[PDB]
RNA sequence: GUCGACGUACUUCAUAGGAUCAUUUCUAUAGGAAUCGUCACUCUUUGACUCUUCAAAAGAGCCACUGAAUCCAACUUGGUUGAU
RNA sequence: CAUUGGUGAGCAGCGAAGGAUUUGGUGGAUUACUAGCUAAUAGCAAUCUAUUUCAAAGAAUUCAAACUUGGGGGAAUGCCUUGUUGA
RNA sequence: UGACGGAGCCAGCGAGUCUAACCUUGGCCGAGAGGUCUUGGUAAAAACUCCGUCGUGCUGGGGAUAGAGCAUUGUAAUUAUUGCUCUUCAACGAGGAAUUCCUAGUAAGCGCAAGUCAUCAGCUUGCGUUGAUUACGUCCCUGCCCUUUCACAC
């Protein structure tokens, strides 16, 4: 049994599930590499959990993301949320708490919606 | 709050279940009260029911708004949200503004892309008492739904003969005062239920000099709604029509909110019964 | 927030709000824009004991791994925190780090004070501490068990079976002094700071000694003597120079005090003047300092709030 | 079963609000029913989430 | 069935949750042959 | 018109004869049937113990010394003149 | 194709006259160190008891004594209380 | 504020043994009823992304319907056989004055499904997908409403 972690990301009807296990660096979304995530114009939204912390944080793990629902924009936001939360959870479960806190600080400083779900519920006046 | 509302709904439905046996024991106790008052003999079953006679020494001290409206009748004023169907036309938006101005504590809310379960949850957490949804057929309002929160009745009305202030009135603004209500010709229990539902949309205790009068009059299961302004001349009261005029027809009454389709039906219109023409239910 | 919010505090500036949650975190948010400007992971710092009735380890217990009360320091730089645990924790909010931790109680008569329990007590019946031994008492009033089953706290007429638990219900900082109070089971724990104990120099130098300060005092360089006494930061030497300055020299010295040492002289005068008998001397010093640098205090409200 | 519930209470799995309750004799009010829940980091809670395939390790499950 | 699905408690726990499995779609997996499915190498060698 | 009178229609109210049990003897009857210091065997029911399934969950926690079991490695013996 | 399914057969790597799991028992610690026994200003510890008994001191509710009872109705005879009769 | 092809790629509602066009040319079988076959004419996720190609304008863009002229093709252009061009006839190129509605998953765009005892198909309702600008102040105006009848301090 390898060390593995399951996390979820949401944006509207989209839902992404990330499995982060011990590995070599394979980052796949829907059975396809992360560098083919469409659209081109929004690929860096998917990339930015990787680029905020560094690829060295991803050097020893495998991320596998399965996404259903929603549209292109919703699915991109669900992917990036699931990947960020899976990084934080893996570094808290099998790596140090200091690494977890530093990752959470970086992600929170850039964008909290990487970590906490953005729910646009109605507000009656 | 998700666990609180489900539990309170269960308790409410349990009370509705036990209400029948409670009523039956109430008539069994009412025979004893009349028998003790008049010196009348008891029937055989009440004579030989020893447990009821032993419990009457306790239950002798037991003695009206409906159950959904009992807790806050006259204590806290209502909050009403008036909304429309999914893609309202300009004329439906005008009528929604008119209905919002008709009610004294009501805000008109854009439907947009709002889902009904999300809207009901938003209304519950925001603390609104009532939700009114308006439907139309090419600019003509055809349906008006009133739902009481958190688990109150949902009544659906078919609107006929709709005339709007944007049409009749060339100018003038509505008074927006706490009005005086007139409920006419509501005799049956269904009529009392409709009177309770419609009455509790308005603020409690209008002051005596209020010039706005809102009238709901029952003619042949059709409720005429009028809004008038009166001036007390020494000769008499002269009346000015100041608001929209429409006829509304109750066709469905359910014991749940708008989101719930499994809610029990208190009353439904039956069009195809053989003797449907003869009866007047309201 | 990720978890159930149990405690809340406002910064005295009013720009930020700090929040203690169920997952052991204290998160700090800005109010003008709802942005989380900080987070402290406080869960591992908490000292949680094991009760005598617990069948689970204090490590695996989740009764008290959070804080139920938090409070900001009046300069807005620290937060004191307490809960249903045996620890009171002090944090520095810009660095998000723990300054000091205080053990609330050492009383074995309380319940959650020990993480580990002596295993001689455990028998095949259970703990020896849980055996109902009130029947051995001499008096009927001691022998009577007036308890109702499952009451969380008990009452005046109904005393609880289990022993009292260690807990802190409210922590606050003092507006006047460098002290804080905690409402705990034993009573009110007042923890204070006295500056007579530590040696904490500020901007020290090889030339700066108490002998050099007294020598400058004898040479009547009063501003230099006062600044050197502040650099040594010793209460007796500050008091010696402060009482040695003449009344005529007080406006010039108070005007020429550097802006860094002026919170120190205000704190010293505030602490000293309430017990001291030199009411007119202290009033003259306060008047001179308020005349010289009221505007600086007005700009730095929260830096000066405790002293003022 | 009620006996299973007793053991789960004494084993530290149950909280009523933020507060852990390891006393089985604790009496629950109608209002207090709505906060009788599993403690976080409970193997029981992880088991039920893992059964529904809805376990999120960021939330600690 | 709709009422039961609405009034389900998320915090329910059963010992059979250790045995039962749910697929990725969210539905219960029911074994066709199970009352296991896998054969050991010792069984496989004899059968072959 | 939850009004009376009359007319009409309906709803519900029976009861016996006999026997047994109930008094730490005797329930009133002589029409009935029971008073004894244990030896063994066989069968049956029940409950404890020890282990365990459904089927988990929690560990009065740490070190040290001293036994035992199991699986590999190595060695030994038997084995294509046949091991399993 | 996937298997965060089971059971196996093998490599690289790790690698000092082996390694890996499991388990019974005993010791120390789990609060902060002033030694054992007794009839205790001392004696004993191999006890004594063949001085261990005398004297002195010592008697209030003028027995006060269920602060100790699940609820509602009762009490033949008990029990309690009060009155009375005969000694 | 394009068009034209290719490629890539993403939803959430909906499951009653119930869901579903008309006329027409004929062949054959049959007592008929009809059956079967043949013929012909009419009713009935999008976005978005990527690649290629055309090309943008009062340099009006289209739609006719007739006629004329000149030629193609011609036995015969009378039948314009037809072709091209001109002429011929109507509207249009984002909608004036007035007026109305509207503050966040809102305005606006995009499709998809359902047809629920009233209402609706000259449509109604739902569902998801993209998703803003500006104000969030103030009683100046135009209305409406309301008042002028426990301590400390005022």
Short mmCIF file of C-alpha atoms in Angstrom, two decimals, chain B residues 3 41 48 53-54 65 106 123 139 143 146 151-153 156 167 194 207 240 248 258-259 273:
data_model
loop_
_atom_site.label_atom_id
_atom_site.label_comp_id
_atom_site.label_asym_id
_atom_site.label_seq_id
_atom_site.Cartn_x
_atom_site.Cartn_y
_atom_site.Cartn_z
CA UNK B 3 -30.50 19.11 10.81
CA UNK B 41 -76.48 10.17 31.54
CA UNK B 48 -67.38 1.81 31.17
CA UNK B 53 -62.85 9.07 33.63
CA UNK B 54 -59.66 8.86 35.68
CA UNK B 65 -54.77 31.01 13.96
CA UNK B 106 -42.00 43.01 0.23
CA UNK B 123 -34.99 32.71 1.95
CA UNK B 139 -47.24 39.58 -20.99
CA UNK B 143 -50.35 32.41 -12.02
CA UNK B 146 -47.51 32.01 -2.26
CA UNK B 151 -42.31 24.62 6.14
CA UNK B 152 -45.61 26.46 5.75
CA UNK B 153 -48.41 26.08 3.21
CA UNK B 156 -51.18 28.33 -6.08
CA UNK B 167 -52.37 50.66 -18.02
CA UNK B 194 -57.01 31.04 2.36
CA UNK B 207 -53.93 52.55 12.37
CA UNK B 240 -61.07 55.70 -5.82
CA UNK B 248 -57.49 34.70 -8.51
CA UNK B 258 -42.40 25.41 -3.10
CA UNK B 259 -39.35 23.19 -3.65
CA UNK B 273 -65.43 14.92 -11.45
#
